[PDB]
Amino acid sequence: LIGAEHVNNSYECDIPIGAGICASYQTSQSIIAYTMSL
Protein backbone atom coordinates (compact mmCIF):
# COMPACT_ATOMS: atom_id res chain seq x y z
CA LEU A 1 0.00 0.00 0.00
CA ILE A 2 1.39 3.38 -1.07
CA GLY A 3 -0.02 6.86 -0.55
CA ALA A 4 -1.64 6.01 2.80
CA GLU A 5 0.07 6.50 6.16
CA HIS A 6 -0.37 3.71 8.69
CA VAL A 7 -1.55 4.71 12.17
CA ASN A 8 -1.54 2.44 15.22
CA ASN A 9 -4.95 3.46 16.59
CA SER A 10 -8.12 1.72 15.43
CA TYR A 11 -11.51 3.10 14.37
CA GLU A 12 -14.46 1.67 12.45
CA CYS A 13 -13.41 1.28 8.82
CA ASP A 14 -15.54 1.95 5.74
CA ILE A 15 -13.47 1.02 2.65
CA PRO A 16 -12.46 -2.67 2.86
CA ILE A 17 -9.00 -3.82 1.76
CA GLY A 18 -8.46 -7.27 3.27
CA ALA A 19 -6.52 -9.12 6.00
CA GLY A 20 -8.27 -7.13 8.74
CA ILE A 21 -7.01 -3.67 7.71
CA CYS A 22 -8.98 -0.93 5.91
CA ALA A 23 -8.32 2.59 4.64
CA SER A 24 -10.17 5.81 5.42
CA TYR A 25 -9.88 9.59 5.11
CA GLN A 26 -9.34 11.19 8.52
CA THR A 27 -7.45 14.18 9.95
CA SER A 28 -4.76 18.72 7.18
CA GLN A 29 -6.68 15.52 6.39
CA SER A 30 -5.15 12.59 4.52
CA ILE A 31 -5.93 8.96 3.74
CA ILE A 32 -4.82 6.61 6.52
CA ALA A 33 -4.78 2.84 7.00
CA TYR A 34 -5.58 1.10 10.28
CA THR A 35 -6.79 -2.18 11.74
CA MET A 36 -10.56 -2.48 12.04
CA SER A 37 -12.39 -2.19 15.35
CA LEU A 38 -14.92 -4.99 15.78
Added chain:
Amino acid sequence: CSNLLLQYGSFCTQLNRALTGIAVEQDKNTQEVFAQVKQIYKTPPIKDF
Protein backbone atom coordinates in the same frame (compact mmCIF):
# COMPACT_ATOMS: atom_id res chain seq x y z
CA CYS B 1 -2.09 -13.70 -28.28
CA SER B 2 -3.28 -10.32 -26.97
CA ASN B 3 -3.95 -9.04 -30.50
CA LEU B 4 -6.75 -11.63 -30.78
CA LEU B 5 -8.06 -10.93 -27.26
CA LEU B 6 -9.86 -7.68 -28.12
CA GLN B 7 -12.58 -9.79 -29.80
CA TYR B 8 -13.26 -11.55 -26.47
CA GLY B 9 -12.46 -8.71 -24.07
CA SER B 10 -16.21 -8.44 -23.50
CA PHE B 11 -16.28 -12.07 -22.33
CA CYS B 12 -13.22 -11.38 -20.18
CA THR B 13 -15.05 -8.41 -18.66
CA GLN B 14 -18.00 -10.67 -17.81
CA LEU B 15 -15.70 -13.24 -16.19
CA ASN B 16 -13.80 -10.58 -14.22
CA ARG B 17 -17.04 -8.96 -13.03
CA ALA B 18 -18.45 -12.36 -12.02
CA LEU B 19 -15.29 -13.19 -10.06
CA THR B 20 -15.28 -9.77 -8.37
CA GLY B 21 -18.94 -10.22 -7.45
CA ILE B 22 -18.16 -13.68 -6.06
CA ALA B 23 -15.29 -12.25 -3.98
CA VAL B 24 -17.36 -9.38 -2.56
CA GLU B 25 -20.22 -11.85 -1.96
CA GLN B 26 -17.91 -14.11 0.05
CA ASP B 27 -16.59 -11.10 1.98
CA LYS B 28 -20.18 -10.06 2.78
CA ASN B 29 -21.15 -13.62 3.78
CA THR B 30 -18.93 -13.53 6.88
CA GLN B 31 -20.43 -10.19 7.94
CA GLU B 32 -24.01 -11.49 8.08
CA VAL B 33 -23.06 -14.43 10.35
CA PHE B 34 -20.47 -13.37 12.94
CA ALA B 35 -21.08 -9.60 13.06
CA GLN B 36 -24.51 -9.86 14.68
CA VAL B 37 -23.57 -7.53 17.56
CA LYS B 38 -21.57 -4.30 17.34
CA GLN B 39 -20.33 -4.43 20.95
CA ILE B 40 -17.48 -6.72 22.01
CA TYR B 41 -18.41 -8.21 25.39
CA LYS B 42 -15.45 -9.16 27.58
CA THR B 43 -15.67 -12.36 29.59
CA PRO B 44 -15.86 -11.75 33.35
CA PRO B 45 -12.82 -12.79 35.41
CA ILE B 46 -15.12 -14.74 37.75
CA LYS B 47 -15.67 -18.26 36.40
CA ASP B 48 -18.21 -19.28 39.08
CA PHE B 49 -21.29 -19.89 36.93
